[PDB]
Write a protein that binds this ligand. Structure first.
Ligand SMILES: Nc1nc2c(ncn2[C@@H]2O[C@H](COP(=O)(O)OP(=O)(O)OP(=O)(O)O)[C@@H](O)[C@H]2O)c(=O)[nH]1
Ligand SMILES: [Mg+2]
Lengths: 429, 69
């Protein structure tokens, strides 16, 4: 009687969802056929025999939804939970927010309602949207608003794959990212910024795989999310209910953009020469180098740190390690938060994915840090925006789809008002 | 002792009723699995039959050369 509802809109969302359902099915002893040869949190029994997942898979390019419709899991998902339109998003926000989704949101929301009618202890939503794209931006923000005006009190998380700092995957990515960031400011309670640049770095250095690919990246994202949800799913000496994050990491109502991290992500033979106790594992956890997002926490202040441990963990060493890590001077918190930690324990050791680059280890930590250095990212991203709005580049592909032009201005200005918060909260009393 | 003799009665009767209902549901699942084979096979038969008929039609059409009297 405690479960979630995971949405995977856009293109990256369905990919990370594929990997995440792989991991969930494989730890829960659930075969890819849906038949078993804890699942009330994610899966559901069809009266008898087989399991079915709690999810909805949105996209407008039927490519990926078809690829999963005839892949290895063709016989797992309810064929009404995979909604593929006809035309494509084409990286322009207004295409998936005013014209195409204008009626697809009706069907998707009716399916969400039919799902929630069956849930018994629903806690919150886990959405997935690569904001750099078109449909994950437009349709994603529109669903966010629709759920926030429909249900309300239910929490809304998110795992957004922002545009990288340096490497390029599209040229219009600042526009349809700023628009979704303006439309996501209030309807979402927790935003966990994921970036495909830092994880490429990690897979290059720690996991020793020189030629990575979105497969391994998504394996790692699935591992992070499973280490997050282990609290609800399985046993734990000190459990957290997802509504924990909604009240521990959102000091002020507007600022809720945090970054995640995981440890220990070490290959097999590289970790064979290592003991990996709580001390070293948590000292590596705070390392700015191996953060999932991309920033320099050493150049900013921290505000809140959730830390979920999993595996056979001894609590005395947990408290000792967190004390010594608060001792450090390079890592400092803001004045208005002296109790800058929030920890949890789950007895379930990490599960390895058969054929996964990650190594099997008993103790693992997953950190979610609401910091203030991540602010600069927006600035940098806003930077790009200005160098495009200085000459109204690419705007006609947006004004052609009913989107009022002025919106852009407002967003880019109103998003800039985020600084009015950020650079303020970084100042002591 | 009497109340235990009776509580075991209730327990056995209920843990038989529930297994019986689950068996009914599994039988219905099997019946639907069986019904699926009909639409799995009739469509295959009709597809192969359309293939044969339309191939024969193509042949009969193409089999019109010249007369040359
Ligand atoms: N972690 C992860 N990120 C991905 C993956 N595929 C794409 N991304 C990122 O998502 C962005 C791609 O934009 P899209 O999501 O394809 O654009 P869209 O909104 O779906 O619009 P359409 O293609 O018309 O459906 C890029 O930033 C990618 O880095 C993936 O498989 N895994
Ligand atoms: Mg796309």
């Amino acid at each position: 009687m405690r479960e979630v509802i995971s949405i995977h809109v856009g293109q990256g969302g369905i990919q990370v969802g594929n990997a995440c359902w792989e991991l969930f099915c494989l730890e829960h002893g659930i075969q890819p056929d849906g038949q078993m040869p804890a699942f009330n949190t994610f899966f559901s029994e069809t009266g008898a025999g087989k399991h079915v997942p709690r999810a909805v898979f949105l996209d407008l390019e039927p490519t990926v939804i078809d690829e999963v419709r005839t892949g290895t899991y063709r016989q797992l998902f309810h064929p009404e939970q995979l909604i593929s339109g006809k035309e494509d998003a084409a990286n322009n926000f207004a295409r998936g927010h005013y014209t195409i989704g204008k009626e697809i949101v009706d069907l998707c929301l009716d399916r969400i309602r039919k799902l929630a009618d069956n849930c018994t202890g629903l806690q919150g939503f886990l959405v997935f949207n690569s904001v750099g794209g078109g449909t994950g931006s437009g349709l994603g923000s529109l669903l966010l608003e629709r759920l926030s005006v429909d249900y309300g009190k239910k929490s809304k998380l998110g795992f957004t794959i922002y545009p990288s700092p340096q490497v390029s995957t599209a040229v219009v990515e600042p526009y349809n990212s700023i628009l979704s960031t303006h439309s996501l400011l209030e309807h979402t309670d927790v935003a966990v910024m994921l970036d495909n640049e830092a994880i490429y770095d990690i897979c290059r250095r720690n996991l020793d795989i020189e030629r990575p690919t979105y497969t391994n990246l998504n394996r790692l994202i699935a591992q992070v999310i499973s280490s997050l949800t282990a609290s609800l799913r399985f046993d734990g000496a000190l459990n957290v209910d997802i509504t924990e994050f909604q009240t521990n990491l959102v000091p002020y109502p507007r600022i809720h953009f945090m970054l995640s991290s995981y440890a220990p992500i070490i290959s097999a033979e590289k970790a064979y020469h290592e003991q990996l106790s709580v001390a070293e594992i948590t000292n590596s956890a705070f390392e700015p180098a191996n953060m999932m997002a991309k920033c320099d926490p050493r150049h900013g202040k921290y505000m809140a740190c959730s830390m979920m441990y999993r595996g056979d963990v001894v609590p005395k060493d947990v408290n000792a390690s967190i004390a010594t890590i608060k001792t450090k001077r390079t890592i400092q918190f803001v004045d208005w938060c002296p109790t800058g930690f929030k920890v949890g324990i789950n007895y379930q050791p990490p599960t390895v994915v058969p054929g996964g680059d990650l190594a099997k280890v008993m103790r693992a930590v997953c950190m979610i840090s609401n910091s203030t250095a991540i602010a600069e990212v927006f600035s940098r991203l806003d930077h790009k925006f200005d160098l495009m709005y200085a000459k109204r580049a690419f705007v006609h592909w947006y004004v052609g789809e009913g989107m009022e032009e002025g919106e852009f201005s407002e967003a880019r200005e109103d998003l800039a008002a985020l600084e009015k918060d950020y650079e303020e909260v970084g100042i002591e009393t | 002792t009497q109340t235990l003799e009776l509580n075991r009665m209730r327990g056995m009767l209920e843990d038989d009723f529930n297994r019986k209902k689950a068996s009914i549901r599994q039988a219905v699942k099997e019946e639907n699995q069986q019904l699926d084979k009909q639409k799995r096979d009739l469509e295959k038969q009709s597809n192969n039959e359309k293939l044969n008929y339309e191939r024969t039609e193509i042949d009969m059409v193409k089999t019109r050369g010249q007369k040359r009297p």
